[PDB]
């Protein structure tokens, strides 16, 4: 791509500069360039990739929600096609970013990921971006998109349970997001609550094994699980 001529190390360096500057679109482009070099990503690099795209898509999701709501209120005086047009524009751009991320995961991050930490990380991402596609899906394929999210989260969950301690932050964040998928996308609030509780409880029981810094890392995501449980019960 447009980053083809830049050194991998330079792209990573610039991704970090872009993060410091809160330039997430640039950060994402730098990391896409780095992935397209064809080498596996390190832990730190994977995190840079995730943060970049999470922020980009996060902004798009927030704007889509503002627009979709304005649209819904318009469909309860006639304002013409503009609200629908502009929501569609934002939606299409969001879909594009999700397709780009899914493309990177498929070519060829997931297939080269052998260690649990990387494989779970990339499958969670795959679940997340199909979840974002699901949030805006209304055509026939809402179901298949939902199943694609579910399948990726499930594979990640199966690996995480076999290969990671209950306090592992990736495992915790995966469970958090799969529990959100159940509640918000799959119309399965009981499953969401059950998942969040079991995850929280099993992590608590394993905190005794951790260093002070790991304990801080694990308890943080645990608090997000607790926050959801409080909202949902």
């Amino acid at each position: 791509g447009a980053m083809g001529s830049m050194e991998r190390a330079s792209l990573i360096q610039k991704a970090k500069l872009a993060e410091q500057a809160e330039r997430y679109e640039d950060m994402a482009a730098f990391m896409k360039g780095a992935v397209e070099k064809g080498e596996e990503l390190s832990c730190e690099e994977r995190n840079l990739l995730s943060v970049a795209y999470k922020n980009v898509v996060g902004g798009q999701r927030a704007a889509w929600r503002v627009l979709s709501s304005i649209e819904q209120k318009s469909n309860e005086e006639e304002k013409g096609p503009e609200v629908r047009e502009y929501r569609e524009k934002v939606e299409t751009e969001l879909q594009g970013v999700c397709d780009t991320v899914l493309g990177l995961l498929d070519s060829h991050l997931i297939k080269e990921a052998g260690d649990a930490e990387s494989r779970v990380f990339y499958l969670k991402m795959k679940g997340d971006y199909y979840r974002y596609l699901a949030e805006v899906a209304t055509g026939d394929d809402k179901k298949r998109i939902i199943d694609s999210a579910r399948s990726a989260y499930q594979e990640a969950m199966d690996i995480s349970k076999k290969e990671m301690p209950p306090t592992n932050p990736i495992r915790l964040g995966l469970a958090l997001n799969f529990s959100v998928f159940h509640y918000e996308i799959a119309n399965s609030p009981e499953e969401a609550i059950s998942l969040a509780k079991t995850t929280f409880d099993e992590a608590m029981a394993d905190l005794h094994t951790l260093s002070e810094d790991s304990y801080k890392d694990s308890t943080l995501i645990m608090q997000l699980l607790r926050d959801n449980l409080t909202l949902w019960t």
Binding site: D128, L176, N177, Y183, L224, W232
Partner: peptide, 4 residues
């Protein structure tokens, strides 16, 4: 709800 919150995600990570």
């Amino acid at each position: 709800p919150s995600s990570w």
